Amino acid sequence: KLKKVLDKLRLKRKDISEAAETVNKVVERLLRRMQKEFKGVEQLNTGSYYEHVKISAPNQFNVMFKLEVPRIELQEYYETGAFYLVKFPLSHFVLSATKMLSKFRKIIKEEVKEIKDIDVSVEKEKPGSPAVTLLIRNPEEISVDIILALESKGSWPISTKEGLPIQGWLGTKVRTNLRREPFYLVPKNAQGETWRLSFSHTEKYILNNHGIEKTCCESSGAKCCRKECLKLMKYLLEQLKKEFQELDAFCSYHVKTAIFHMWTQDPQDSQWDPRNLSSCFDKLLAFFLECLRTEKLDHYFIPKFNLFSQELIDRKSKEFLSKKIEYERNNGFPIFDKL
Amino acid sequence: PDKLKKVLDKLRLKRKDISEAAETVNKVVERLLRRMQKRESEFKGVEQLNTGSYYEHVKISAPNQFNVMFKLEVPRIELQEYYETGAFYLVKFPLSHFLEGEVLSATKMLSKFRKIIKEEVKEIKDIDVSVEKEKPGSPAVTLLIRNPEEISVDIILALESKGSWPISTKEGLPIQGWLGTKVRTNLRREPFYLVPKFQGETWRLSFSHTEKYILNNHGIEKTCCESSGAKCCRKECLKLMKYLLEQLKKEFQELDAFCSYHVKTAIFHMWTQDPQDSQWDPRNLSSCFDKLLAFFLECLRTEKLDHYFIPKFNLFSQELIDRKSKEFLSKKIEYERNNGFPIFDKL
DNA sequence: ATCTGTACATGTACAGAT
DNA sequence: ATCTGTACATGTACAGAT
DNA sequence: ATCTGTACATGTACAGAT
DNA sequence: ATCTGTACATGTACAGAT
Ligand SMILES: Nc1nc2c(ncn2[C@@H]2O[C@H](COP(=O)(O)OP(=O)(O)OP(=O)(O)O)[C@@H](O)[C@H]2O)c(=O)[nH]1
Ligand SMILES: Nc1nc2c(ncn2[C@@H]2O[C@H](COP(=O)(O)OP(=O)(O)OP(=O)(O)O)[C@@H](O)[C@H]2O)c(=O)[nH]1
Ligand SMILES: Nc1nc2c(ncn2[C@@H]2O[C@H](COP(=O)(O)OP(=O)(O)OP(=O)(O)O)[C@@H](O)[C@H]2O)c(=O)[nH]1
Ligand SMILES: Nc1nc2c(ncn2[C@@H]2O[C@H](COP(=O)(O)OP(=O)(O)OP(=O)(O)O)[C@@H](O)[C@H]2O)c(=O)[nH]1
Ligand SMILES: [Mg+2]
Ligand SMILES: [Mg+2]
Ligand SMILES: [Zn+2]
Ligand SMILES: [Zn+2]
Secondary structure, eight states, X not given: OHHHHHHHHXXXXXXXXXXXXXXXXXXXXXXXXXXXXXXXXXXXXXXXHHHTOOOSSSOEEEEEEEEEOOSOEEEESTTOSSEEEEEOOGGGOOOOHHHHHHHHHHHHHHHHHTOOSSEEEEOOOOTTOOEEEEEEESSSEEEEEEEEEEEEOSOOOGGGTTOOOOTTTTOHXXXXXXXXXOEEXXXXXXXXXXXXXXXXXXXXXXXXXXXXXXXXXXXXXXXXXXXXXXXXXXXXHHHHHHHOGGGTTOOHHHHHHHHHHHHHHSOOGGGGOGGGHHHHHHHHHHHHHHHHHTTOOBOSSOTTOBTTOTTTSOHHHHHHHHHHHHHHHTTTOGGGSOO | XXXXXXXXXHHSOOHHHHHHHHHHHHHHHHHHHHHHHHXXXXXXXXXXXXXXXXXXXXXXXXXXXXXXXXXXXXXXXXXXXXXXXXXXXXXXXXXXXXXXXXXXXXXXXXXXXXXHHHHHHHTOOSSEEEEOOOOTTOOEEEEEEESSSEEEEEEEEEEEEOSOOOGGGTTOOOOTTTTXXXXXXXXXXXXXXXXXXXXXXXXXXXXXXXXXXXXXXXXXXXXXXXXXXXXXXXXXXXXXXXXXXXXXXXXXXXXXXXXXXXXXXXXXXXXXXXXXXXXXOXXXXXXXXXXXXXXXXXXXXXXXXXXXXXXXXXXXXXXXXXXHHHHHHHHHHHHHHTTTOGGGSOO
């Protein structure tokens, strides 16, 4: 039943090949153009495709163009925890996010203009968004969200001190090492000079290193169903989102965040046995429903930032989604059979 | 259970002793390391790498023996395996002073290393420290220190190579079911080391850096022995086995062919065979130590203990240790086992 | 003025001491 | 159970070199 | 600084065995 | 139906060459 839904959601090797061939061509060319400002940006592949939790089709790719910036001093934007002003080549741009993003965007647009071999344009800017989004066609439509990121090597900002609570799951050495990696700021505004913390590199490591046992999902270990539960939850939200515009405030990052909390609460690999796929997916739904009822879903890395605060999503939107989730749950998920 | 807990208490190093030992050792090592740079010496660029029992937290009784590698990156090198041994190699291509004819001479390089070290120790006035008489074929320059208490420091010259590990290790390090494939792949991306062992130009592979990572990352669960996880008894078993051999070795010269590396190697195989943290529960310390002894005994009787990293190299071959020596040790181990380990009460 | 090899500054796991 | 010394990895300041 | 070569993890596809 | 073995595909870290 759920195994059959997963088969439908499984990407095809043929489609992966053709999509990657084109995406890589464009990304490689844009990256080269950035190397003569922005000289020295490096590529960092992130999100669902590179975490192996993309579903249905290879039609959405996420790439960070990270740029190492020396001595930078952060000031937290009021008490938000996730948003910062940045202070001290890039003198052209207090470091303005929208100004930097504009130049980044312009360069990208100029280079896409010179691309004749592939059918590719740049999507109209969504205000406040950090992304420069490319729309490709080898007939099939493919999105590429290209994210400018500042890389900083200092200690992570104080607001994350008590975040990433993996100690009982992945452990203290993993946590200490992860927090020795750089941190990232992307120009998602809150206004025009604000940046937002990104942990896409950390999320990627976790997705690919997700077990309490080192062998989880390896050739000489036991398969778990952690990723399959993530896929099913993503698909449920995607399907619901297609039908009801009441759910515009919700995104896949809410699901990702929720499952991180679940994986922390249930650290044992044996609590995610493939044979218990139903129970596992069900307990995930129950957890997400408690998050909705209590209007509380803390950022996994920034515990004081509630993604489900009133200020961000209306009670009515949360109650709408609850009713819709409870319905699918108690009727054998008819929405999975939809197209 | 509790008898063995009491032995471990005795074996536990004291923080006072650790402090005083480390203070002195670090002073000497730092000074020797600086001498290798600050002068236009062939060893310019050596880096320090702390290895062995003290740095793995399995040193027992006293902080009286420290192991330190002075590693030197050597680019374009071609290795030739010395007669299918698997562990021994000739090296070919600053260091031209030792490059006796395409071949990089181990003993020549070790001699110069040794001379420099001797000269620098001679200039040390703060501390009571001399250089021990060279043991032929040994790779070590050994320092003997006294803040009254006697402390050995074995300083090992090592060539660092960043290429893939030699073919003879391909099927070694069988940690797939225990620490897993990602850990193994990453470990094998680290450099490999050659220490100075026809004979005078041969070098031997070293995996001290890999052994160190394993000792400190020894569980199938990432939380093994961490503040938010469960204690295992893997290291405690290693200490007990080390102590049994150490005690036996100080009494009987019949056991001169044996060393702590045999015990370390044996326990690596045991940890591979019994990968689950639950097979090394603290409450089962006795059973765990017992099964280790039984395994070591089988190795001795069948004359077979494969190097953990170089499977075709048998540390217990006839060619290396007489059957007599192995039978002597078997009898001695079986005796202690079946009489409540009287040798643990000694001293 | 700028760059750099060396030493120090900071954080934390591990294990011993209390 | 909490506190504390050592080791070790990574960042960063800087007298000496360029 | 950039580019490639190598090795192997994480996938998908499918047949034969269980 | 599930598991196991092989083949085929992509991603990615890092060394050595340029
Ligand atoms: N902090 C933060 N990170 C976000 C947010 N949205 C997206 N991200 C990050 O950007 C990545 C890409 O976002 P998306 O492409 O929308 O989602 P995805 O995880 O790739 O999954 P898909 O919906 O299958 O594409 C996510 O995996 C996160 O790492 C957000 O609101 N906050
Ligand atoms: N890799 C990565 N991609 C990100 C991150 N933040 C945002 N993105 C990308 O940018 C897209 C839009 O970012 P959002 O966080 O949704 O921002 P927005 O669309 O301006 O605002 P809302 O969706 O209303 O919150 C995401 O779908 C991702 O593809 C991040 O931290 N990392
Ligand atoms: N391949 C190999 N490595 C060895 C051998 N002897 C020692 N080593 C390595 O060098 C390290 C130091 O050796 P020792 O000081 O004799 O032993 P140890 O492991 O530190 O334990 P102690 O007996 O407490 O000193 C070991 O941990 C090994 O990594 C040997 O015969 N062969
Ligand atoms: N760190 C480190 N120390 C090593 C290594 N190999 C040897 N040593 C040290 O050097 C000492 C002598 O090396 P061995 O190979 O044991 O000496 P040998 O002269 O060949 O003979 P025995 O000591 O009788 O086995 C060891 O006890 C260690 O202290 C190595 O790979 N790494
Ligand atoms: Mg995505
Ligand atoms: Mg030692
Ligand atoms: Zn898994
Ligand atoms: Zn343990």
